[PDB]
Amino acid sequence: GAMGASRLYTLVLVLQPQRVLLGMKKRGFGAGRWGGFGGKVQEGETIEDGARRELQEESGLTVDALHKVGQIVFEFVGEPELMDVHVFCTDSIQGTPVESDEMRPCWFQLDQIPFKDMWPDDSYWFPLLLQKKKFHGYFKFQGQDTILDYTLREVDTV
Numbered sequence: 372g373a374m375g376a377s378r379l380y381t382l383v384l385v386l387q388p389q390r391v392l393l394g395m396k397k398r399g400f401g402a403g404r405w406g407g408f409g410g411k412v413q414e415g416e417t418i419e420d421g422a423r424r425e426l427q428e429e430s431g432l433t434v435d436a437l438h439k440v441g442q443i444v445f446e447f448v449g450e451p452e453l454m455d456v457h458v459f460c461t462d463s464i465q466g467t468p469v470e471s472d473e474m475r476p477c478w479f480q481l482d483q484i485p486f487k488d489m490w491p492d493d494s495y496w497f498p499l500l501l502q503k504k505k506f507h508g509y510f511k512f513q514g515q516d517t518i519l520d521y522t523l524r525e526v527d528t529v
């Protein structure tokens with residue numbers, strides 16, 4: 372049948388030449404895991420403006436520009452609505468990261484990416500982001516730990 376309907380999300384990775392900024396989610400879905408900054412796109416809001424807003428809300432940072440790097444669709448067994456996640460990166464940040472209600476930030480050196488405490492899917496697509504390759508992916512999860520199916524492809528244009 373038809374693909375499930377999806378909710379539009381953004382995900383932002385602050386990626387500098389030697390380090391990446393990650394936030395530990397403090398509560399709720401995905402609590403305890405390190406990852407990028409993001410959330411739901413709002414009505415009338417462009418995707419990139421939503422990405423800027425979520426980054427500012429969750430880390431306090433503003434950015435000059437955001438670069439589109441990928442798109443990932445997430446499906447969770449038992450929930451028919453998908454997450455349609457537009458992934459961005461930036462390397463020019465203004466301000467300092469601050470702990471928010473949602474996220475506790477730390478910088479990680481790029482030879483210390485904490486995959487064991489990140490979402491399982493990050494092990495597959497984060498290496499492509501680091502190579503400056505654009506990608507489309509899909510991950511079907513049972514709960515928060517188990518991947519039942521995934522697809523991933525490098526693309527020329529996100």
Ligand SMILES: Nc1nccc(-c2ccccc2)n1
Nearest residue numbers: 380381382409410445490492
């Ligand atoms: N790495 C990962 N894995 C599963 C889900 C997500 C997600 C990110 C931003 C917003 C909503 C979901 N991210």
Ligand SMILES: Nc1nccc(-c2ccccc2)n1
Nearest residue numbers: 377378400447450452453454
């Ligand atoms: N807590 C939870 N569990 C499973 C799925 C979801 C979901 C959230 C937003 C959009 C699509 C799915 N949320």
